[PDB]
Structure formats: structure tokens, C-alpha cells
Enzyme design. Structure first.
Site, PDB file in Angstrom:
ATOM      1  N   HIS A  62      -7.513 -13.402  74.264  1.00  0.00           N
ATOM      2  CA  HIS A  62      -7.644 -14.263  75.447  1.00  0.00           C
ATOM      3  C   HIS A  62      -7.952 -13.468  76.704  1.00  0.00           C
ATOM      4  CE1 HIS A  62      -3.238 -13.932  74.558  1.00  0.00           C
ATOM      5  NE2 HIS A  62      -3.065 -13.772  75.859  1.00  0.00           N
ATOM      6  N   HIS A  92      -3.651  -7.644  83.477  1.00  0.00           N
ATOM      7  CA  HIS A  92      -4.818  -8.237  82.853  1.00  0.00           C
ATOM      8  C   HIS A  92      -5.556  -9.025  83.918  1.00  0.00           C
ATOM      9  CE1 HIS A  92      -1.714 -11.349  82.776  1.00  0.00           C
ATOM     10  NE2 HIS A  92      -2.730 -12.153  83.028  1.00  0.00           N
ATOM     11  N   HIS A  94      -8.367 -12.558  84.665  1.00  0.00           N
ATOM     12  CA  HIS A  94      -9.003 -13.806  84.275  1.00  0.00           C
ATOM     13  C   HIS A  94     -10.326 -13.818  85.014  1.00  0.00           C
ATOM     14  CE1 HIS A  94      -5.114 -15.404  82.762  1.00  0.00           C
ATOM     15  NE2 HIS A  94      -4.631 -14.640  83.727  1.00  0.00           N
ATOM     16  N   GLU A 104      -7.647 -18.099  88.849  1.00  0.00           N
ATOM     17  CA  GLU A 104      -6.694 -19.136  88.492  1.00  0.00           C
ATOM     18  C   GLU A 104      -6.170 -19.808  89.758  1.00  0.00           C
ATOM     19  OE1 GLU A 104      -3.974 -17.436  85.396  1.00  0.00           O
ATOM     20  OE2 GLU A 104      -5.406 -18.529  84.124  1.00  0.00           O
ATOM     21  N   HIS A 117      -3.756  -9.951  87.431  1.00  0.00           N
ATOM     22  CA  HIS A 117      -2.335 -10.181  87.316  1.00  0.00           C
ATOM     23  C   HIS A 117      -1.587  -8.936  86.883  1.00  0.00           C
ATOM     24  CE1 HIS A 117      -3.122 -14.753  86.749  1.00  0.00           C
ATOM     25  NE2 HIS A 117      -3.172 -14.353  88.007  1.00  0.00           N
ATOM     26  N   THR A 196       0.726 -18.558  83.061  1.00  0.00           N
ATOM     27  CA  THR A 196      -0.489 -19.395  83.003  1.00  0.00           C
ATOM     28  C   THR A 196      -1.137 -19.461  81.633  1.00  0.00           C
ATOM     29  OG1 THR A 196      -2.088 -17.719  83.595  1.00  0.00           O
ATOM     30  CG2 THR A 196      -0.925 -18.889  85.441  1.00  0.00           C
ATOM     31  N   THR A 197      -0.573 -18.768  80.635  1.00  0.00           N
ATOM     32  CA  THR A 197      -0.938 -18.982  79.237  1.00  0.00           C
ATOM     33  C   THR A 197       0.326 -19.310  78.481  1.00  0.00           C
ATOM     34  OG1 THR A 197      -0.841 -16.581  78.729  1.00  0.00           O
ATOM     35  CG2 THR A 197      -2.981 -17.485  79.196  1.00  0.00           C
TER      36      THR A 197
HETATM   37  N1  LIG Z   1      -1.295 -15.133  83.276  1.00  0.00           N
HETATM   38  S1  LIG Z   1       0.200 -14.662  83.518  1.00  0.00           S
HETATM   39  O1  LIG Z   1       0.915 -15.777  84.083  1.00  0.00           O
HETATM   40  O2  LIG Z   1       0.272 -13.400  84.242  1.00  0.00           O
HETATM   41  C1  LIG Z   1       0.930 -14.364  81.960  1.00  0.00           C
HETATM   42  N2  LIG Z   1       1.063 -15.223  80.996  1.00  0.00           N
HETATM   43  C2  LIG Z   1       1.734 -14.720  79.885  1.00  0.00           C
HETATM   44  C3  LIG Z   1       2.043 -15.304  78.654  1.00  0.00           C
HETATM   45  C4  LIG Z   1       2.695 -14.642  77.651  1.00  0.00           C
HETATM   46  C5  LIG Z   1       3.070 -13.326  77.823  1.00  0.00           C
HETATM   47  C6  LIG Z   1       2.778 -12.684  79.010  1.00  0.00           C
HETATM   48  C7  LIG Z   1       2.136 -13.302  80.041  1.00  0.00           C
HETATM   49  S2  LIG Z   1       1.651 -12.785  81.608  1.00  0.00           S
HETATM   50 ZN   LIG Z   2      -2.735 -13.913  83.978  1.00  0.00          ZN
END
Ligand SMILES: NS(=O)(=O)c1nc2ccccc2s1
Ligand SMILES: [Zn+2]
Length: 258
Positions: A62, A92, A94, A104, A117, A196-197
Site C-alpha cells: 500500500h 511513509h 501517500h 490525505e 507521515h 488512515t489505513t
Molecule cells: N497513515 S497513518 O495514519 O500514518 C498509519 N496507518 C497505519 C496502519 C497500520 C499500522 C501503521 C500505520 S501508520
Molecule cells: Zn500515512
């Protein structure tokens, strides 16, 4: 898990396996700059990354994660709206299929080309899995990317992407300094939200920097050559891996700056 950002498993479907997707503190959100209130009680953010130890970069199907040694307090986030100490675990991004989308969070409905992020967990809960069960378990520092001049500090990331093209591939990624991804100013907005995932847990204090970083079109084009698919599978370009803004509900977005 079978969720994604394709034409039949995208964000609008996630609620079926993760009903918290329709919850009261979901992320991301639109930041209405005229409604966000300056809070003079907010402190300066403390980003202490001098001792950061990056280890590895992973294509997880992803996005790609740059992972850090979070076995002790090296790189930490403190201050700002936070109480206590939060350890950097990974960063990471997006991003979009074209420069007019990718972020996002949005700012007065403006979408940036991408969003970084930097993910941190509250050491008072001992490990990540315990922290995500708590409303103050995580702190994510979000930084917008716009396309213009190249970001020198991003180039080492860009250059390894060819080696982790497909889901499940990783590569050694030691000695990377995340300070090279920060803008000049640490002025921020903050609000309580979620991952957010999936699993979309409502355990995040969001800190979103006002000042975007500039990256080159060539840099973001390399992000867009990654694949969601595994090796040898039909190629699906890793693009548009962003969740859209979710309802703000009973939440206040606060500004650190006047
Ligand atoms: N996109 S985030 O909110 O930074 C994020 N989502 C997730 C989901 C599962 C594990 C780590 C992260 S870090
Ligand atoms: Zn993220």
C-alpha cells in the site's frame, strides 16, 4: 485483509471489514484555516532525530515504509500538544497519479501532490500493539509535498525504490537522516484522529505542519513507478494510495501559530 485503493476495494468499502471507518474521530480531515483556532497554550514541537537509526525500507503493498530501530528512545517527538515521549517507528508517504492529488489532509480543500507521515508511539504503553488501543497512543507528524525544486534529503529514498518495486520486497536502509525531510518552520495544526489505513484505530494525535516541502517532478515520478502487486503479478502502479477527508464531527483543529 483484502482492502486497498483499487476500483472495488477502496476507502469507500473499508467500513465493511472495519466499521470504525464510520467513527467519530477518523482521519484525514480538511483543515479549514479560517476555523482553526490559535491556541497560545500549545508548545513548540520538539523533533529530536539526532540519534535516529533507520534500518530497512519495505514495500508493504500500500506504500513503502522506512523503518527505524524503536527498541529504545533514539528518535522521539515531544512537546507541541503532546504529554510524554513518542518514539519514531517508521515513515511513509501517500501520493497521487498526478500532482493535483495525493495528500490525505487538505487545506481549505487544496490537495497537495503527496503527504509524508512520520509515525511515533507513546512509550508509556511499552509497545506499538498496546499503544494503538489508547486514545493518546500515537503521534503522527504530517508534512505536505508540493512539486517544484528537488528535495536533496529525499533523493536516497527515491534511488532505492527500483529495488523494492513490488509488495513484500525490502532492502537495507541504514544511516538515513529523516531531518532532511523537514521544512524550515515547525508551525502546525493539531487535532485528535485515527490511523488512515486499516485498522483505522482512533489512537492518534495528528500534528500537521503548515509549511510544505518541495520535491521535484522527477522525484515524485519515481514514487509512481512502484507497484501495489507482488512480483510477477499483473502490474498495478502504486498511485492514489490516499484516503479522502473524513467528517470532522465534534472536533476542534488548533493552530500553534497566530
Ligand atoms: N497513515 S497513518 O495514519 O500514518 C498509519 N496507518 C497505519 C496502519 C497500520 C499500522 C501503521 C500505520 S501508520
Ligand atoms: Zn500515512
Amino acid at each position: 485483509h483484502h482492502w486497498g485503493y483499487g476500483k472495488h476495494n477502496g476507502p469507500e468499502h473499508w467500513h465493511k471489514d472495519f466499521p470504525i471507518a464510520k467513527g467519530e474521530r477518523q482521519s484525514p480531515v480538511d483543515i479549514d484555516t479560517h476555523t482553526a483556532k490559535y491556541d497560545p497554550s500549545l508548545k513548540p514541537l520538539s523533533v529530536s532525530y539526532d540519534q535516529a537509526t533507520s534500518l530497512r525500507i519495505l514495500n508493504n503493498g500500500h506504500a513503502f515504509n522506512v523503518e527505524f530501530d524503536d527498541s529504545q528512545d533514539k528518535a522521539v517527538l515531544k512537546g507541541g500538544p503532546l504529554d510524554g515521549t513518542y518514539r519514531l517507528i517508521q515513515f511513509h508517504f501517500h501520493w497521487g497519479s498526478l500532482d493535483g492529488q495525493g495528500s490525505e489532509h487538505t487545506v481549505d480543500k487544496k490537495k497537495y501532490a503527496a503527504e509524508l507521515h512520520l509515525v511515533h508511539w507513546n512509550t508509556k504503553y511499552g509497545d506499538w500493539g498496546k499503544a494503538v488501543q489508547q486514545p493518546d497512543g500515537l503521534a503522527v507528524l504530517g508534512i505536505f509535498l508540493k512539486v517544484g525544486s528537488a528535495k536533496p534529503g529525499l533523493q536516497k529514498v527515491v534511488d532505492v525504490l527500483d529495488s523494492i518495486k513490488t509488495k513484500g520486497k525490502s532492502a537495507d536502509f541504514t544511516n538515513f537522516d529523516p531531518r532532511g525531510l523537514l521544512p524550515e518552520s515547525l508551525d502546525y495544526w493539531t487535532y485528535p484522529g485515527s490511523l488512515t489505513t486499516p485498522p483505522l484505530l482512533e489512537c492518534v494525535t495528528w500534528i500537521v505542519l503548515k509549511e510544505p516541502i518541495s520535491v521535484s517532478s522527477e522525484q515524485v515520478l519515481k514514487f509512481r513507478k512502484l507497484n501495489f502487486n507482488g512480483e510477477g503479478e499483473p502490474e498495478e502502479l502504486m498511485v492514489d494510495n490516499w484516503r479522502p477527508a473524513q467528517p470532522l464531527k465534534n472536533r476542534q483543529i488548533k493552530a500553534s501559530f497566530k
